[PDB]
Design an enzyme around this catalytic site. Structure first.
Site, PDB file in Angstrom:
ATOM      1  CG  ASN A  67      38.441   4.615  30.145  1.00 14.88           C
ATOM      2  OD1 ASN A  67      39.601   4.753  30.530  1.00 14.88           O
ATOM      3  ND2 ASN A  67      37.645   5.638  29.884  1.00 14.88           N
ATOM      4  CE  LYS A 194      37.176   4.600  35.553  1.00 18.93           C
ATOM      5  NZ  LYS A 194      38.508   4.049  35.917  1.00 18.93           N
ATOM      6  CG  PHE A 224      33.271  10.303  34.546  1.00 21.85           C
ATOM      7  CD1 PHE A 224      31.888  10.180  34.610  1.00 21.85           C
ATOM      8  CD2 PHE A 224      33.816  11.142  33.584  1.00 21.85           C
ATOM      9  CE1 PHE A 224      31.073  10.871  33.725  1.00 21.85           C
ATOM     10  CE2 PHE A 224      32.999  11.830  32.699  1.00 21.85           C
ATOM     11  CZ  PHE A 224      31.632  11.699  32.775  1.00 21.85           C
ATOM     12  CG  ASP A 226      39.871   9.579  37.134  1.00 21.51           C
ATOM     13  OD1 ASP A 226      39.344  10.439  37.881  1.00 21.51           O
ATOM     14  OD2 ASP A 226      40.803   9.821  36.346  1.00 21.51           O
TER      15      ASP A 226
HETATM   16  N1  LIG Z   1      37.216  11.209  35.532  1.00 22.57           N
HETATM   17  C1  LIG Z   1      37.639  10.899  34.303  1.00 22.57           C
HETATM   18  N2  LIG Z   1      38.411   9.820  34.147  1.00 22.57           N
HETATM   19  C2  LIG Z   1      38.857   9.466  32.911  1.00 22.57           C
HETATM   20  C3  LIG Z   1      38.549  10.214  31.779  1.00 22.57           C
HETATM   21  C4  LIG Z   1      39.176   9.577  30.699  1.00 22.57           C
HETATM   22  C5  LIG Z   1      39.210   9.941  29.224  1.00 22.57           C
HETATM   23  N3  LIG Z   1      38.187  10.922  28.842  1.00 22.57           N
HETATM   24  C6  LIG Z   1      38.366  11.567  27.525  1.00 22.57           C
HETATM   25  C7  LIG Z   1      37.052  11.693  26.795  1.00 22.57           C
HETATM   26  C8  LIG Z   1      36.550  12.922  26.861  1.00 22.57           C
HETATM   27  C9  LIG Z   1      37.441  13.848  27.663  1.00 22.57           C
HETATM   28  O1  LIG Z   1      37.547  15.185  27.118  1.00 22.57           O
HETATM   29  C10 LIG Z   1      38.757  13.031  27.738  1.00 22.57           C
HETATM   30  O2  LIG Z   1      39.722  13.409  26.749  1.00 22.57           O
HETATM   31  C11 LIG Z   1      39.836   8.464  31.236  1.00 22.57           C
HETATM   32  N4  LIG Z   1      39.607   8.429  32.555  1.00 22.57           N
HETATM   33  C12 LIG Z   1      40.101   7.530  33.609  1.00 22.57           C
HETATM   34  O3  LIG Z   1      41.309   8.161  34.043  1.00 22.57           O
HETATM   35  C13 LIG Z   1      42.191   7.183  34.606  1.00 22.57           C
HETATM   36  C14 LIG Z   1      43.544   7.271  33.921  1.00 22.57           C
HETATM   37  O4  LIG Z   1      43.331   7.373  32.512  1.00 22.57           O
HETATM   38  C15 LIG Z   1      41.506   5.841  34.398  1.00 22.57           C
HETATM   39  O5  LIG Z   1      40.904   5.506  35.653  1.00 22.57           O
HETATM   40  C16 LIG Z   1      40.494   6.106  33.279  1.00 22.57           C
HETATM   41  O6  LIG Z   1      39.343   5.252  33.280  1.00 22.57           O
HETATM   42  C17 LIG Z   1      37.690  11.408  32.014  1.00 22.57           C
HETATM   43  O7  LIG Z   1      37.297  12.242  31.018  1.00 22.57           O
HETATM   44  N5  LIG Z   1      37.284  11.674  33.269  1.00 22.57           N
END
Ligand SMILES: Nc1nc2c(c(CN[C@H]3C=C[C@H](O)[C@@H]3O)cn2[C@@H]2O[C@H](CO)[C@@H](O)[C@H]2O)c(=O)[nH]1
Length: 320
Positions: A67, A194, A224, A226
């Site tokens: 991810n 993350k 997280f 990102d």
């Molecule tokens: N901070 C953060 N980052 C997330 C996510 C996600 C996906 N999360 C899903 C799961 C539960 C949430 O409701 C979202 O729909 C990807 N990513 C990251 O976003 C960036 C582009 O997708 C990448 O660095 C992924 O690893 C997140 O929830 N928070």
């Protein structure tokens, strides 16, 4: 602060030269979000796969192992169930598509042995998933560690956490090298984690806070760090960028992983979310930091074009 994410990122935010928090913007965003009592979207069941508790647990581990880093031209896009997806949803749709066609991505034996060609097919679409070879190596690492350490069952790892979100992050980073998300800033270790923290929240989501997704300390997870949440925090005026960094993001110049500028964006993302959580809580809208993260990440999916581009970092695993 049992992982040291808030403590170490706080040192970065206090010394940061390219990035700062507008605490006025935090209060103003808090006032507005608390007025219309915003909650995060329910954990998305359409594009996340489901099955038995043992298979679902391994699926979450695999999902969050890879991810990261979906940007590049030509844009990596996927066709699943009549619709075309990019970014994260392309990752999620690609795994779900594969599992539905009987690809055993929940079997440690298969994961440990997975070829470059196998994962190229799983992620087949327009363009190519960035860092393809890297995702093959991580799925092999993930598979063989599952097999060797946990009898091919992530449920064993989760069981050993004793419903502590923080204990489970620590068990994942200990066992799975690829989940070790730390950096240094002016000679001090900064801890981020993350993908390990996302993983814990995704279990909570998939299992509805029950069984293997049961955790008594989800409040201890941070955001997280990102590239979408900072883009959302910049758009809402909470994160401010100094001239050189602002111009880099606008020109879409790549930023080296673990460089001061990248570490400052990520540390300021953690503290941007935490300051928004505190402000919201003070205005009587108590959310956990991971919930504020989800809410902001959701906003990231429908930003108005003309918004400053997300920072472009090639996620590196030079220490395999
Ligand atoms: N901070 C953060 N980052 C997330 C996510 C996600 C996906 N999360 C899903 C799961 C539960 C949430 O409701 C979202 O729909 C990807 N990513 C990251 O976003 C960036 C582009 O997708 C990448 O660095 C992924 O690893 C997140 O929830 N928070």
């Amino acid at each position: 602060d049992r992982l040291g994410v808030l403590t170490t990122t706080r040192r970065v935010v206090e010394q940061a030269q390219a990035v700062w928090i507008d605490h006025d913007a935090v209060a103003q965003i808090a006032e507005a979000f608390a007025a219309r009592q915003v909650t995060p979207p329910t954990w998305n069941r359409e594009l996340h796969w489901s099955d038995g508790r043992e298979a679902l647990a391994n699926y979450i581990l695999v999902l969050d192992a890879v991810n990261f880093c979906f940007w590049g031209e030509p844009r990596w896009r996927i066709e699943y169930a009549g619709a075309v997806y990019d970014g994260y949803w392309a990752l999620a749709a690609s795994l779900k598509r594969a599992l539905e066609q009987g690809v055993p991505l929940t079997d440690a034996s298969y994961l440990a042995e997975i070829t470059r060609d196998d994962v190229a097919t799983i992620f087949a679409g327009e363009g190519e998933i960035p860092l393809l070879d890297e995702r093959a190596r991580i799925l092999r690492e993930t598979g063989s560690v599952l097999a060797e350490r946990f009898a091919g069952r992530f449920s064993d790892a989760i069981a050993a956490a004793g419903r502590s979100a923080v204990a489970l992050v620590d068990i994942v980073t200990n066992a799975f090298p690829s989940f070790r998300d730390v950096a240094t800033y002016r000679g001090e270790q900064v801890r981020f984690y993350k993908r390990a923290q996302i993983l814990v929240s995704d279990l909570y989501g998939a299992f509805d806070g029950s069984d293997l997704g049961a955790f008594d300390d989800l409040g201890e997870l941070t955001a997280f760090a990102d590239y979408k949440v900072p883009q959302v925090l910049h758009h809402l005026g909470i994160l401010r960028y100094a001239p050189a960094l602002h111009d880099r993001l606008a020109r879409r110049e790549e930023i080296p992983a673990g460089s001061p500028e990248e570490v400052e964006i990520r540390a300021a993302t953690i503290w941007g979310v935490e300051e928004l959580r505190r402000a919201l809580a003070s205005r009587g809208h108590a959310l956990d930091a991971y919930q504020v993260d989800w809410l902001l990440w959701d906003e990231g999916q429908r930003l108005p074009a003309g918004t400053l581009p997300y920072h472009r970092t090639r996620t590196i695993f030079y220490l395999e």
